[PDB]
Design a protein around this ligand. Structure first.
Ligand SMILES: CC(C)[C@H](NC(=O)[C@H](C)NC(=O)OCc1ccccc1)C(=O)N[C@@H](Cc1ccccc1)[C@@H](O)[C@H](O)[C@H](Cc1ccccc1)NC(=O)[C@@H](NC(=O)[C@H](C)NC(=O)OCc1ccccc1)C(C)C
Lengths: 99, 99
């Protein structure tokens, strides 16, 4: 679809039988999922933001179903305020900025 | 133009005779400019991110020339790692997410 930016570009995602709402975020390298247990093993990682750095679990090969389009990727899981779909996921659903 | 998200969607902006590079950031409500003095008066404001909340100077009616398209807006100025063009500015250059 074509999402205008008058409101936050939140979309439905489906990660392992769990529906969430994630924000499509062009200013995020990575995808960060807020406090939702993912089956599988992970490796420790730290993303930085505005202000600080949070500790996250990185999971590889996670399947995320984003607004009707699937995409497998590294997914970071950690105490972030929102689900963030970063460019790593956004390139796979073929998402572009447009003006 | 059409910016794919394989790399950070950084673009040229012109803010008061100053060229900067800003990231077009769909996950930012506001626009945040990194440590570059803006003529004019401001009001105190605080944006939150990943981890924490930075103090910024909000300036109204700031003219930002974004990748060939102008846009006047509230611009927040404060110790952020990057210039971030938030949705507030991104709606005016007619920028949409596209997949
Ligand atoms: C999701 C992250 C992986 C993302 N980080 C990255 O992409 C960075 C560059 N990559 C990275 O960290 O790489 C890993 C690494 C590790 C070690 C060494 C080197 C590298 C990120 O948080 N980046 C953010 C800022 C940034 C930019 C450049 C460099 C570093 C950080 C925004 O782009 C991102 O879009 C966030 C999304 C977000 C929203 C809400 C909560 C948490 C995260 N927006 C923001 O932080 C913006 N805030 C907002 O939009 C808030 C929500 N609105 C607001 O403040 O309005 C008033 C308000 C006040 C109080 C409550 C509610 C509203 C900010 C730019 C102004």
């Amino acid at each position: 679809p074509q999402i205008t930016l008058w409101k936050r570009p939140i979309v439905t995602i489906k990660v392992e039988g769990q529906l969430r709402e994630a924000l499509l975020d062009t200013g995020a390298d990575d995808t960060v999922l807020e406090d939702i247990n993912l089956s599988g093993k992970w490796k420790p990682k730290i993303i930085g933001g505005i202000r600080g750095f949070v500790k996250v679990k990185q999971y590889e090969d996670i399947l995320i179903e984003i607004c009707g389009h699937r995409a497998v990727g590294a997914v970071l899981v950690g105490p972030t305020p929102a689900n963030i779909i970063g460019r790593n996921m956004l390139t796979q659903i073929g998402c572009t900025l447009n003006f």
